């Protein structure tokens, strides 16, 4: 039937558990390395590790050791890109080291680290240059494989550091960094490896960022500037000057993310409305500035704190094929596109299986749907062209219950069902053999494999003892590796499976049949290019070889309506109801308007509403090219005219050096008339004020309110600016008028007396007591009560102009008391100022006389003569019943016995009860 | 009958008019000078002058001239005090000069002036030292009779410059000046001849430096709420003057600091009418009440006057006018202000029926210093150069009036009053009150002359001249010990002056002997001889004796002391008399008690408290016993903390985080050495200090988190306990604001203005709203306001916001229409799903709607305005302007809305519709 070999190997170290990282190194070397690492729970995440090395297809592993003292290698060991050099890092309790090897891990030389470690990053082409992120947010660099080190930046952000492009930027030693400047600022720096001392420079002028520097592998550079009202986003093509990215003007953005800047254009996702659910997919032009709509809604989750994810996948086998998941209402649908985002379509159902009754769904009512990147407790692989295998549902939407493994071998044109429940999938020999293992918690020893692209499957016992399946790997050939811990023991075991005994013959050039790449409409001209791949013949058993030849038949097509899409500000009308696709101009934008900050001398390029698909290679010249070659920019009218006083302004005292400053925005080319009126008769006309750079002096004589009016007049437009100023300076003193003592739940009339009588514009801050934030009042008087007893501080603050006066006063709040009203004589009013000291002394003398006439305690009588113009008094009698005797005694000592007052020479005042 | 000589002289220069100044010079010289000056009307006041000199009792005047070019000497020529030196000043059009003479005006030497002139001032004793006030407010000085000059100060105040005392201050070259410092400050300088400056304490002043001839010095410090006044005795440290604590003062004025005490007048309540007369102690600090109400007017702009007069004949006799309700009464005192009494009526005259007033119902009243003259003349001044002679005009009844002016006199210092003249008369004393001359003050010409030799009991008339003369002025020989009178005036408007020198010496050839005088004991209205604890007796010339009182007059020879009695003591600071006067004792008033310590009593010093009684200052009664009440109280306790104040440097309104905040603390009433200063800045920073107010250095702090904080300070002593609080706010960031307003709306339509700020709900914000033509804005605490527009056209609406100490401001232009028609508009429900409140979205939607309406009706586009409102349900208003045929347009628009659907392509495959709205 079949023919294969299985070789098992157990890691002899029984002290093995948790995780492991297995990696090959180089081609035509046959050397494999394994790192067995032990994680820790309860937020510990501390590690213990062991190293294994093989040099014979992974059949004999030796456990490597380093010195009598065993160094604990951390999880991350870094290989050199493109060049076989290995670096291992170690971490303990605040003590670290490194190990270097240039002999495929044969001789590890130890070196120390004079700093912490978090991650590393090599150079794309230079094998010996590498930089390091120090855990306390530092950036070091080394050009000698990390033997010696030097310092660069000290406040770098997490994982926003990138090397220069190999092909672009002309400089291989550039380092783009994002770092914290000032207190609460972030800026984008650019240094060199050897000289970062004073050589860096700043490409963006302003340089504020909320941690969002991003430069993808290709030629584009991005920047995210946070602002006051609405944030902005800038872009740089070929490291040129930055330009503000053009999004839909009124589709306001919240967050955005760069999905893929592949080939010559950019794909971005922008969440418009804060649904925390749906994103919109937009596509740019060559420079990455003019963005247009592509897809409406896509799923979005926040798995990690800083990392968000968007349900979209590029098929790496065929360039220009994308899959996505939309969410409308509460329904999750799946769509796929071959036109690189122009037109999306649903998935074609298979309607067949090994146990598939054909009563299942038809096109019109329910389709196929797939789980892309989200696994509600999934892998979709694509290493070979046209082979797309994944788990999904089949119906009107996706659900969490059903997980069925479907596959397609012709890039989505023909779908077929294979497995029930999820299965780990592995391709071998450029999609020559497809292996699958059931993902489950129970142990097993089975193995599914297919040779005819998923049409006929075969089972085989690859081992004897059942093993828990942990992972599958393949050679950078037909060597498969299955690693996992067995049922009985808890130690690791690897099984190397060799399919090379079967079909030993090498494929010739005539052993493949041609398969033309089509779409769901049967059209061959995809992206203006007819493509055809090679598929192994069913009646042929051979190995596809060291290098696979495919996509040999590639022809060009003539340009058609399907090869053009809408530009910035244009959308498809009626969903192409009339005939075919038509890009009509939406309401918000018209092609007449100039772009933001068009400066004279430069030339912006407007569009007619149609643009060729980027990287489409159809026969150009004719066929609705619509290349405008529009170079123009018009003269600007005076806009954003601003007038102010030097500093924070809006406060003046008479006879003071007031300095007025004026500023403009759009342009200084035209001669401008500046008419100026300062509201006090001073009329004056000036010219070239914004270009002169000199302020205007003025001194106001009379206190009052004034209005400054300025008019800027040109041949293009006409603008006006106004500024109201107040000159109200003198504030001498204030006073808080308040009763010195009052009972609980009694209405208190607080008053704020100022030096000028009823000032026109005053604000009052009132501080009651324990409550911190004060009350705002426009009137002099307020009314308040006291629920608590004891002593309370009442504070008042006033500020007419830019000067503040403030006064506090302590008041007593009683509880056990009796109230007695008191009339005074009429003559006293002729010698009664509102001075509180006079009132206090009058109350003291009245209390003294009452104590002399009743022989009762003096501290138990409180006299308050009030602030009213008619002299009215209140007598509070405390208890701490016998209180009736004291009350009667006081009433008799008031009525029957006159309480006399010697005010001035020959003037007597009397006090009695008050109705 | 009588015997006298009259010698007339006419200034031969017929070109003479306007004014003249006549002055003598020296004794035993017989030299007189006259300066005839000609003023000019119509705000000109430019002068032309001539000089006359005589050397024989004014019988032969020579018109002096100086050089071929006649220099016009201005009004002021200055003589040397005490020393015969004369200085003349000249003025032209910005060119001046001076003339000096040391030979009684025999040889005038000319010198120039390198500056302007306004007034001069000599030294009390140094004849060659003199200072000058330059018109543009400068002060120059010269020690060589004004030949050479040097500069002192450049911003001096008008007539507040004084020389040092001759007896006091130990320094003769001191100059006390008041000058303007900084911008809007005034200070008191003390300068010397060689260079100018301050040794004594000083501050801000509102032009009120005053140093009377005697040993006292005063100062008036203006403050914020209530001003203060300081005093300095014998040029010592200044002390705050003690007035009644609750009798609040408005203005005060120093009347007389004569002998050993001070008299001040203080207006308590702003009646612009009555002042209160107060008396001080030796140092001039503890003031007590003396008199209640006195008249007060503002005749000149800077000069005020108070109706009170000191009798220069007898020290300690004062006259005053009180005003109660609307009645003006007159009072006099002999006790130097202790007890006042009304005037005794005469009840007799040459034509005096005795039915006139009696004591109980109506008295005598006199016009002291006030001349209410609706008609011609009527000006009254009461003079007293001789002891006991007081002559003046007044009324007789219950009060003073403007009508009646009758000249009364008293020769025994107010004990016996007598009526003399009807209507006013100029009066002149000769030979220490030996001959009394009088001339009727009137507009008509006259040639009569009244004179009396028996102290105003028998009067005689005499034709002193032949032709009737207009009476201009009267003068006498220096010393007032001769009998030469001089009457000057122009005769019958003959355009020239005439002087008449009258000599009474023929009738009085004898020199008085020591036995030609009779004794007159000085008494009061009660007949008591012990006045001021001193029996006094003066000399009066006998009626049967014709002699000249002589070069020097001997009087008050009998002066004996009396034993101290109740009448020789008065109340001290804070004590008043019980019941009323002339009835029933210095009792302590309510506001002050003798327990309290004085202001700023420092440990180690000893203040002297009082019992409520003090001896009349300068009373020389037999002391030792008789209620002396000399306490000899030397003690001082520690003072409690009073007037604790805490603030930020300057007028800090608001603060931003991470800023240099400087806190300052100060005390006022009293100072204490050991002091606890507890301090809490409301952000966890607790700290205790000592000697904060004495160090004088602020405290630095930087707030980190924005918010509101409270600074609390506590001063703790063994005497008391004080606390000071200061609330501060740190609310700095204001990024941007926006005025949300409909771009256009009709007349009398309710407009909802809104002010959007960067924070959605800022806690404490004030909003200033500027509607349009009205200047003063409206104040608001809420974001939104509602207003209308009565006028049409274009209107600017402005809004201003200020949370902390930062201001944001935004304006917007709105259109107000008149000829319009309103159409409501429903939008589709789907549109609400893509409708943000961004105004640009709304404006573009309105623009597209207007475009489609213009395409569907072919009517003008500018006459259709679409406003889609800010409401969450999308509602639109369409305004159709006229500048009838408007019905056709309205019907066309309604049909183009209903019958023809107005489509809107929002997004790919989404159509919106608009129609009419119920
Ligand atoms: C690598 O190995 C393959 C097959 O083993 C061989 O064809 C190839 O030539 C080798 N590479 C080189 C550079 O020789
Ligand atoms: C960089 O610095 C080194 C010294 O550290 C110096 O020799 C070299 O010339 C510098 N290179 C540049 C480009 O500044
Ligand atoms: C400045 O003023 C000159 C003449 O007043 C005018 O020609 C010019 O256009 C103005 N603006 C400039 C130089 O930018
Ligand atoms: C003052 O208190 C009285 C009595 O409680 C109250 O009627 C009045 O409204 C208060 N406020 C005033 C008078 O402004
Ligand atoms: C002035 O002269 C007279 C007459 O000789 C003489 O009595 C008198 O004493 C002189 N004056 C003085 C101040 O001596
Ligand atoms: C005048 O001189 C004194 C001491 O000679 C000096 O203190 C003072 O400052 C001088 N005046 C001025 C204005 O400098
Ligand atoms: C002046 O004298 C004449 C007689 O010589 C006399 O009739 C007259 O009354 C006197 N008085 C006046 C004012 O004429
Ligand atoms: C505190 O202030 C007093 C002044 O009352 C001073 O005498 C003393 O030396 C000061 N102590 C200090 C500064 O330590
Ligand atoms: C008010 O001020 C406090 C500062 O303590 C701040 O935390 C709060 O956000 C502000 N606004 C409201 C509505 O409390
Ligand atoms: C103004 O605002 C109020 C709510 O504060 C609303 O009820 C009213 O309809 C608004 N009126 C206009 C004319 O906008
Ligand atoms: C931001 O700008 C919009 C205009 O698009 C304005 O309506 C709004 O008031 C501004 N401020 C805030 C806080 O949104």
Numbering used by the authors:
A (entry chain A): 131 to 212, 216 to 510, 517 to 615, 619 to 1022, 1032 to 1066
B (entry chain B): 131 to 212, 216 to 330, 335 to 721, 724 to 1022, 1032 to 1066
Reproduce passages from the article.
Two roles have been identified for VPS10p members; in particular, SorCS2 and Sortilin are well studied for their function as extracellular receptors for the cognate proneurotrophin ligands to regulate synaptic plasticity and trigger apoptotic signaling, and they are responsible for binding and sorting a diverse set of ligands for secretion, internalization and endosome to lysosome sorting. Each chain consists of six domains; a large N-terminal ten-bladed β-propeller followed by two 10CC domains (10CC-a and 10CC-b), two polycystic kidney disease (PKD) domains (PKD1 and PKD2) with an FN-III topology, and an unpredicted C-terminal membrane proximal domain (residues 958-1066) that we termed SorCS membrane proximal (SoMP). The cross-braced homodimer architecture and the domain composition of the VPS10p subunit followed by two PKD domains and a SoMP domain is predicted to be conserved among the three SorCS members.
We have determined the crystal structure of the unliganded SorCS2 ectodomain at 4.2 Å resolution. Sequence analysis indicates that SorCS1 and 3 share this domain composition including the SoMP domain. Except for 10CC-a all domains participate in the large dimerization interface that has a buried surface area of 5790 Å2. The PKD domains of both chains twist around each other in an anti-parallel fashion in which PKD1 interacts with PKD2 of the other dimer chain and vice versa.
